[PDB]
């Protein structure tokens, strides 16, 4: 709907399971990115000039771990305040994405790689409600990001 408390619980819950195996889950996210849009590889500094996604890279792990953390925090924020607040960081994030060649048409790619990751993290605990909670948070965070991008360009 607009993030109920049982929806926020599920995001936090699946988020903690994700965090439990960063090496594994973060490698798996970039696999799902590249399965969707193989052309995206080149945008990523730690993937460029590599054949396969690295499995024990600290840069990949740090990046993909931050990404998930910000969707999960966006979802708590929506639950609690009703909105996503734009701060310096999301302003900062807009200029970096503009610097790296990210367009609005790229957002659906990372959104589906994140849904598929989480589905594999929770396994049998997956529900259509968890799915809609991550969807809402991602979508609300991208809208903020996208305008900070559109203001940087
Ligand atoms: C809400 C959705 C997204 C979130 C929360 C987000 C978050 C981030 C963050 C936190 C970083 C590192 C920022 C820094 O400290 O420099 C970053 C970098 C990056 N992101 Fe995203 N991102 C999102 C969507 C996307 C999309 C759709 C793409 C395009 C395929 C993308 C591509 C990149 C690239 C190319 C970098 C630079 C990382 C590097 O090359 O080292 N992002 N993103």
Q: How many C-beta neighbours within 10 Å does residue 128 have?
A: 7
| Ligand 1 close to Cβ of residue 141 (< 6 A) | yes
Most ligand 1 atoms within 8 A of CB, residue of 96, 108, 142 to mutate? 96
* Annotated binding residue 97: yes
Q: What are the residue boundaries of the structural domains of the chain, listed by start?
A: 1-153
Q: What is the DSSP string of 50-72?
A: -SS--SS-HHHHHHHHHHHHHHH
Quote the CA–CA distance of 34 and 107 in Å, as a whole number.
14
What are residue 89's phi and psi, to 5 degrees? -55, -40
Instruction: Specify whether the CB–CB gap between 117 and 69 falls below 8 A.
Output: no
35/27 Cα distance (integer angstroms): 13
Q: Which two tokens stand for residue 39?
A: 């052309």
- Residue 117 burial (C-beta neighbours within 10 Å; 0-12, 13-18, 19+): buried
CB of 89 closer than 6 angstroms to any ligand 1 atom: no
Q: Is the distance from the beta carbon of residue 127 to the nearest atom of ligand 1 less than 6 Å?
A: no
Given a contact cutoff of 8 angstroms between Cβ atoms, the answer to whether 40 and 34 are in contact is yes
Q: Smallest Cα–Cα separation from 33: which of 99, 84, 107, 88?
A: 107
CATH architecture of the region 1-153 = Orthogonal Bundle (1.10)
The residue to mutate among 50, 110, 118, having the most atoms of ligand 1 within 8 angstroms of its beta carbon, is 110
HSE-up (13 A, CA, CB side) for residue 96: 11
Method: X-ray
Question: 10: which 2 tokens?
Answer: 């599920």
13 annotated as belonging to a binding site for a ligand: no
Q: Is 106 in the pocket of ligand 1 (CB under 6 A)?
A: yes
Ligand 1 mean position to 116 CA, how many Å? 18
Cα 121 to chain center, whole Å? 14
């Amino acid at each position: 709907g607009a993030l109920t408390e049982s929806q926020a619980a599920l995001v936090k819950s699946s988020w903690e399971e994700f965090n439990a195996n960063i090496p594994k889950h973060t490698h798996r996210f970039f696999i799902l990115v590249l399965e969707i849009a193989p052309a995206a590889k080149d945008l990523f500094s730690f993937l460029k000039g590599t054949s396969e996604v690295p499995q024990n890279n600290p840069e990949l792990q740090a990046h993909a771990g931050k990404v998930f953390k910000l969707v999960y925090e966006a979802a708590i924020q929506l639950e609690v305040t009703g909105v996503v607040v734009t701060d310096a960081t999301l302003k900062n994030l807009g200029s970096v994405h503009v610097s790296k060649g990210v367009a609005d048409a790229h957002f659906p790619v990372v959104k589906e790689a994140i849904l598929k990751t989480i589905k594999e993290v929770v396994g049998a605990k997956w529900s259509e409600e968890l799915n809609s909670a991550w969807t809402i948070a991602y979508d609300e965070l991208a809208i903020v990001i996208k305008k900070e991008m559109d203001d940087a360009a």
